[PDB]
Amino acid sequence: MTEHFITLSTTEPNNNIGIVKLRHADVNSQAIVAQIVENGQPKNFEGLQPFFCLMAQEATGQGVSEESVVSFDAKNGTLKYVASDNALQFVGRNEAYFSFRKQEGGRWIEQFSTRTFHYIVEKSIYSQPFKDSNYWWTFKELYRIFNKYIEDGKKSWEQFVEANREILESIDPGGVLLAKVIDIEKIVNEKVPAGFKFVLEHDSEYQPEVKVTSYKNAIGTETDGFDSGPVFGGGTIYNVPVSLSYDRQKVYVEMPKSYTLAGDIILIDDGTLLVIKETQVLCFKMSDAKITKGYVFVA
Amino acid sequence: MTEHFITLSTTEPNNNIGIVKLRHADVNSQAIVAQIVENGQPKNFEGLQPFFCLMAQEATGQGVSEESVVSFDAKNGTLKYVASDNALQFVGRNEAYFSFRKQEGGRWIEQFSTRTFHYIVEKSIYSQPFKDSNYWWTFKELYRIFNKYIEDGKKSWEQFVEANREILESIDPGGVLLAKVIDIEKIVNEKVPAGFKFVLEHDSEYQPEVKVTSYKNAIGTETDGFDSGPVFGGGTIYNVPVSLSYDRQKVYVEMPKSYTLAGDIILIDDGTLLVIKETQVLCFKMSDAKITKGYVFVA
Amino acid sequence: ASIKKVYRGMKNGAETINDDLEAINSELTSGGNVVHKTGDETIAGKKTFTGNVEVNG
Amino acid sequence: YRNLPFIPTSAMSYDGAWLEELIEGYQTLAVEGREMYSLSFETQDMQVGGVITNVKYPPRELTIKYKLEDRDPRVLQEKFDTLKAFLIRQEDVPIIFNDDLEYTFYGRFKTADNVAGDTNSIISSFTVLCSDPFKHGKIQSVKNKVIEVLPYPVKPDKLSFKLLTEGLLATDGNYRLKSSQAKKGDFLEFDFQTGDTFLNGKVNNNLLDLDSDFKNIRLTTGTDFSSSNYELTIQYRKAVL
Amino acid sequence: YRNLPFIPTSAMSYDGAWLEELIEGYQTLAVEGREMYSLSFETQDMQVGGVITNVKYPPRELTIKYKLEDRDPRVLQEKFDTLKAFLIRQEDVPIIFNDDLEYTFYGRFKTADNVAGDTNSIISSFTVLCSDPFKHGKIQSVKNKVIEVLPYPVKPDKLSFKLLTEGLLATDGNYRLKSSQAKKGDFLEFDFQTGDTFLNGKVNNNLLDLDSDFKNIRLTTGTDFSSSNYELTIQYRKAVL
């Protein structure tokens, strides 16, 4: 692949750089090896992700792009961005810059950009057609069609229940089955992992084993102070049945509906987390990984 | 982070000399390091709170822009002001200066300020308006609308299900019975080891422990080739609840009826076997023994 | 370097690859069965130097 | 109403102060010579063609077109008396333009074009001779090597050396800076290009550098001095023509 | 809409790059001096008429009329700063024109014409001194003799000889290249006109040629060196005025 060696500054204008010329149809070949300099010295963007930022066409307002840089060395301040379809979209002069951003999920912590540079895109035998940006239309049509499903879905469901009105009243006389099912769900809500979902964020890249225990009146949780409870040290310790579900650095702990406890989330600086609501404690023990954050699941 | 060094005077009639250039998208990085000098000697602003005063174009009043400087050494006449979101809001050619006041409470006493310096802000990909769906937008505007569609969409769905529940559920004496049963039927189909049985033949004479996991879009199982799926390297990993049954050199693994998968049986060199049906993969990990054969149980 | 085998439908596809790449890269800087430009190492076998050899120590 | 002083697009900052701000009625109309530079050549012509003996960089003078006006002829005369007093300087002065605020010229007032003795609204021009034709940017402190895009070779301002070994032998491939029998065992060496040499705190001009040392060193876009023997802090200013 | 850089009919290529491509708003309007050349004469006048002592070929300078324009005066200043940095060169640079792409000139930026400090759309010129007034075409490698239509006598670039007899005596009728006690029995020797001489692989600048040998040889349209004693490979470039 072709390498274009350039030095870019954050504090000085990038006018003295050579002519950066790239071909229109080049796929992943045309790479821009850039040295990041700040006040004459190389810049350390350690902990920050570099981005290629191409500004839209002033005339039409089309052609804006922000791309994650794959290969880069933060310690010495070098990056090797390979031009993409969106980068060599417009044949001719282009105005772009590199931004360095540290993002914590959705929120921005810090971001620093290099001074704008100019590059030219040469005409190729091939000319890639671009779809006129419609992010707003696509997003709202999806929202429109989903709300149409809610409107039509409520009407069709009411039509269904009301048509089967007599059947639903004559299904169970008195409540012989209802009283039986209420005894089944009583045990399903405490022995089977039911409706209670807790999320545990970790530092590990793998799937750590989580063990959950439930107990009342442990040290410092009793209502009338220390050693005021009936059983000193804590009551009966219940091993909570779990249905573990895993994502990158996230553990979805599904637990029975009886163990539902919304209290204070206390994180000890290791593989242990607690949910304390008055006297009731729900303990979360994790093996071979450290817990970073703990919260009740929300869609 | 990027620093900008300026030696500002209070006596020398500069008015416009002393340039500082930043850009729109630079959250908490680009900071101004200033040295305050009076009659050729550094000025001590002890007891006076420094302020960043900005004279923004087409956004003037009585309090055009004023922000308190937090990092400063009044003994040597040095300060460090980090440009805020408000500071970077005004894209163009602006004028700024630093104020120092000894405010008592409401009314001020002593307020001396430095000479004016040029504070210019360059546009970013975020500040520049771009054309989408035959309308002109900025990033922050679309990001707000999209996140609003997500927030309101989920609230609308949460209510759709809840309202449709109370039609069948509350409006019927025997309809509660119907609804409860479907819920129990699903928990038993997903969390309880029931309708699915798989046989694992081994070399061991004992009872080897088997661990079962289910995941979609695993490495090299995606529909449109490698790295074509929404979550690279496998989606969500579900720890399959199992009920183990043993015979001589045979392990009967009982699993919930939802994890029922009839696909290709792949045996790996060790105590590991996979059942792959397009994207859906069912993994079998056996400890202390070697899998020889694997097949779905038949009667 | 001790590396794990990569196969289709592997539990932890990306994780295994990362550990394999890190294990190989560790041997490129120090230890393993390769001679490095830094550190004290022991070499065995008939080594024929066709070029010029310079010793400063 | 408010009598606000007007500062034009291409205004001149002579010794940090604006002349249009100094003198009421003064206005800088145009500034010529800074945008384009000419070179001096020494040519030794022969039978076919001719070889260049030496290339010189002449000191350029920038022409400043101005307009001074006042209704009262007595005040107008006093206004010029102030203008002349400010311009006529014995030493070089730092010059910055309102359109090119990044750089700084270093010149002195030279000659003024003929001025009419009527109208009460006079337009003339005066020239400012710059001994150094380069305009210098901000002052930068860089450790060991210069990696910045330098359009012209730059003579440094200060070289702060910090020894680690026996002797000092600074090199970049072209220039060799020698210091035999130097202060070994971590001792700072200042090499102030726009003055003299220093040793730790005290001024040491006689002993500091060796006989075959260089003080005419120039920094290119890729100048490297980085060595395990010394920790260098280069102090330079970007020079442009 | 596409912001395509425009390349005019007679565009100049300074060091392989187009200035109009380099600088947005730059455009080469006209280029003068290349189309017609003047000669220098040494005349020894007498009673009737006057005889020409010597005919000299002066180094010609090509004047380049350009136009640079930008709405913003700050950017325009920066545009010139880039133009100067690119033009001002310490060594000679290869120049090619958009209308005469076949040949290549070798010059350097000399003097820039006066530039106005207003309008924001500037039109002026600059001279480019070519030390060698000949434009050189493609490099050609011909065996023994040159039969190509040469408009001007050309000094070669490389003369590759391959011996067959005892000694070397290259001749065309006017020039005699002699090498006594040469490497007999098929030995290649390079005579690099734009540097030094080579023997087989090693550099032999001191001994290769004899005292009465020629290195000022010029090739005409009908120059023949073909002989049974040596196999010559002439390397030359067509020179035009």
Identify which of B5, B14, B19 has the shortest CB distance to residue D102: B19
CA atoms of D235 and E7, how far apart (whole Å): 41
What SS3 class is residue B199?
Answer: strand
Which are the contacts of B84, defined by CB distance < 8 A and separation ≥ 6?
B67
Sort out which chain D residues have CB atoms less than 8 A from A12's CB and list them: 137, 148-149, 238
Q: Show the CA angle centred on residue B33, arms to residues B28 and B35, nearest 5°.
A: 160
Sort out which chain B residues have CB atoms less than 8 A from D13's CB and list them: 14, 16-17
Sort out which chain A residues have CB atoms less than 8 A from E79's CB and list them: 15
Our answer on whether C and D touch (3+ beta-carbon pairs < 8 Å) is no
Type of residue at E188: L
Across the interface, whether the CB atoms of C18 and A205 are under 8 A apart is answered yes
The alpha-carbon gap from D17 to the nearest alpha carbon of chain A, in Å, equals 25
The alpha-carbon gap from A113 to the nearest alpha carbon of chain D, in Å, equals 17
First-residue to last-residue Cα distance in chain A: 44
The alpha-carbon gap from B243 to the nearest alpha carbon of chain A, in Å, equals 14
CA atoms of A168 and A160, how far apart (whole Å): 11
* DSSP conformation class of E130: E
CA atoms of B251 and B271, how far apart (whole Å): 13
Across the interface, whether the CB atoms of D65 and E117 are under 8 A apart is answered yes
Is residue B286 within 8 Å of B206, Cβ to Cβ? Answer: no
Which are the contacts of C25, defined by CB distance < 8 A and separation ≥ 6?
none
Whether chain B has a CB inside 8 Å of the CB on D98: the answer is: yes
Query: Which backbone phi and psi does D9 adopt, to 5 degrees?
Result: -55, -40
Is residue E201 within 8 Å of E187, Cβ to Cβ? Answer: no
Is residue E205 within 8 Å of E115, Cβ to Cβ? Answer: no
What SS3 class is residue B25?
Answer: coil
Across the interface, whether the CB atoms of D16 and B19 are under 8 A apart is answered no
Identify which of B5, B13, B118 has the shortest CB distance to residue D16: B13
Cα dihedral value B89, B95, B100, B106, nearest 10: -60
CA atoms of A282 and A215, how far apart (whole Å): 7
CA atoms of A16 and A37, how far apart (whole Å): 14
CA atoms of A111 and E58, how far apart (whole Å): 59
Across the interface, whether the CB atoms of A14 and D149 are under 8 A apart is answered yes
Type of residue at A66: E
Which are the contacts of B191, defined by CB distance < 8 A and separation ≥ 6?
A192, A193, A194, A243, A254, B241, B256
Whether chain B has a CB inside 8 Å of the CB on C14: the answer is: yes
Method: X-ray
Chain B, chain C: beta-carbon pairs less than 8 Å apart: 44
* DSSP conformation class of A43: P
Whether chain A has a CB inside 8 Å of the CB on D139: the answer is: no
Greatest distance between any 2 Cα atoms in chain A: 90
CA atoms of D81 and D91, how far apart (whole Å): 19
Identify which of D13, D18, D101 has the shortest CB distance to residue B118: D101
Sort out which chain C residues have CB atoms less than 8 A from A205's CB and list them: 15, 18
Across the interface, whether the CB atoms of E117 and D41 are under 8 A apart is answered no
- Resolution of the PDB structure in angstroms: 3.8
Across the interface, whether the CB atoms of B187 and A188 are under 8 A apart is answered yes
Across the interface, whether the CB atoms of D41 and E109 are under 8 A apart is answered no
Type of residue at A268: I
Which are the contacts of E209, defined by CB distance < 8 A and separation ≥ 6?
E177, E178, E179, E191, E197, E215
Q: DSSP string spanning B207-261?
A: ---EEEEEESS-TT--TTSTT-SSSTT-S-EEE---EEEEETTEEEEEE-GGG--
CA neighbours closer than 13 Å in the CB half-sphere of residue B254: 11
Chain A: residue nearest E76 by CA? Answer: A15
The alpha-carbon gap from B39 to the nearest alpha carbon of chain D, in Å, equals 14
Is residue B10 within 8 Å of B34, Cβ to Cβ? Answer: no
Strand duo A31-38 + A3-9: pairing: parallel
* DSSP conformation class of E58: P
The alpha-carbon gap from E23 to the nearest alpha carbon of chain D, in Å, equals 14
* DSSP conformation class of A83: P
Whether chain B has a CB inside 8 Å of the CB on D95: the answer is: no
Which of A 56-115 lie inside 8 A of B, CB atoms?
Answer: 56, 60-62, 64-66, 97, 99, 108-113, 115
Which of E 21-40 lie inside 8 A of A, CB atoms?
Answer: 21-22, 24
Q: Where are the beta strands (DSSP E) in D83-232?
A: 93-97, 104-112, 121-143, 145-146, 158-162, 168-171, 176-179, 188-192, 197-199, 202-203, 223-224
Identify which of A134, A135, A178 has the shortest CB distance to residue B176: A178
Sort out which chain B residues have CB atoms less than 8 A from C13's CB and list them: 218-220, 232-234
Q: DSSP string spanning C1-57?
A: ---PPP-TT-SSHHHHHHHHHHHHHHHHHSSTTS--SSS-----S-----S------
